[PDB]
Amino acid sequence: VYEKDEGQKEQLERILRQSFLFNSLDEKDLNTVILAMQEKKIEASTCLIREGDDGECLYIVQSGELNCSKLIDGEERVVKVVGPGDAFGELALLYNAPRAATVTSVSACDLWELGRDTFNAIVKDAATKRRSMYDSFLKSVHILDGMDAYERGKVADALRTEMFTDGAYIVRQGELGDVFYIVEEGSAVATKSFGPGQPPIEVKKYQAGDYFGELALINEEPRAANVIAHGICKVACLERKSFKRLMGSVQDLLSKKASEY
Ligand SMILES: Nc1ncnc2c1ncn2[C@@H]1O[C@@H]2COP(=O)(O)O[C@H]2[C@H]1O
Numbered sequence: 510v511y512e513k514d515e516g517q518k519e520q521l522e523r524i525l526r527q528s529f530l531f532n533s534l535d536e537k538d539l540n541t542v543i544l545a546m547q548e549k550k551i552e553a554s555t556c557l558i559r560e561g562d563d564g565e566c567l568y569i570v571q572s573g574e575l576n577c578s579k580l581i582d583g584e585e586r587v588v589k590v591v592g593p594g595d596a597f598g599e600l601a602l603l604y605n606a607p608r609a610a611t612v613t614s615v616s617a618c619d620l621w622e623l624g625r626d627t628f629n630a631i632v633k634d635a636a637t638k639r640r641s642m643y644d645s646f647l648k649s650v651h652i653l654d655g656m657d658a659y660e661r662g663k664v665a666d667a668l669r670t671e672m673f674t675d676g677a678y679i680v681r682q683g684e685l686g687d688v689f690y691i692v693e694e695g696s697a698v699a700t701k702s703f704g705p706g707q708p709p710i711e712v713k714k715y716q717a718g719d720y721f722g723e724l725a726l727i728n729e730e731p732r733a734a735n736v737i738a739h740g741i742c743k744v745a746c747l748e749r750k751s752f753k754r755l756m757g758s759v760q761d762l763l764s765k766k767a768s769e770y
């Protein structure tokens with residue numbers, strides 16, 4: 510029941526590292542969570558979690574789709590579809606509350622289940638601290654100064670962190686771009702080739718609190734420059750879909766500031 514083969518562990522590690530509540534774990538803590546996780550397969554149209562019940566575990570989806578719904582004014586109202594890579598059933602564990610929605614599979618699903626005790630011991634404090642630290646950080650990132658606390662908190666809830674050592678390319682000129690970056694600590698440099706057959710030249714130096722990688726998202730174009738870690742660089746990362754859905758009018762600010770390049 511805890512036994513997993515190498516293939517299973519590898520796929521589980523990949524999805525866990527990308528999952529918001531687990532993304533801040535060190536590799537050994539993530540390994541301990543992996544040890545604790547139990548596989549759970551369900552057929553389509555299985556009513557897995559029921560609104561109002563006690564919650565003693567959470568799930569992450571390896572494959573399949575499920576609907577989350579709320580019983581409101583006598584009908585089930587679907588409020589979110591979850592699919593591969595998504596975690597669900599975490600709210601009852603994060604906030605010590607009854608299940609806030611019913612979750613039903615739409616297809617056959619392959620899930621991994623984590624118990625409340627392991628979540629409490631290894632994940633819960635780290636996750637809530639990370640969120641708070643993201644909130645603190647964003648309050649000193651000035652392009653977000655126009656947001657209110659709730660807008661900024663939503664962005665904070667969609668951030669992941671990545672570390673890059675000296676010389677590692679965070680983005681490469683001409684590649685597809687689906688991530689917006691803000692430097693949390695360390696440094697980076699942008700270099701840009703101004704035409705075919707021209708080597709790139711340094712065009713900007715980044716420090717903590719600076720952002721980059723917005724142009725591919727706003728303009729729907731390939732990356733316009735390389736961004737390379739200088740010494741070391743720790744970046745907060747916001748995916749394209751979250752950028753578009755959460756940044757609001759900051760997208761307009763970013764668009765207008767593009768003329769400064
Ligand atoms: N809008 C929503 N409100 C509440 N729960 C939701 C929503 N969307 C998805 N869910 C998921 O449905 C789950 C129901 O169990 P939990 O309350 O433990 O955790 C909840 C979330 O993972």
Ligand SMILES: Nc1ncnc2c1ncn2[C@@H]1O[C@@H]2COP(=O)(O)O[C@H]2[C@H]1O
Pocket residue numbers: 680686699701712713720721722723724725726731732733734735736770
């Ligand atoms: N002179 C410049 N031209 C274009 N992009 C730049 C320049 N200086 C820094 N950048 C950043 O480099 C990033 C490369 O990825 P993007 O095109 O998504 O967004 C770009 C900007 O954030």
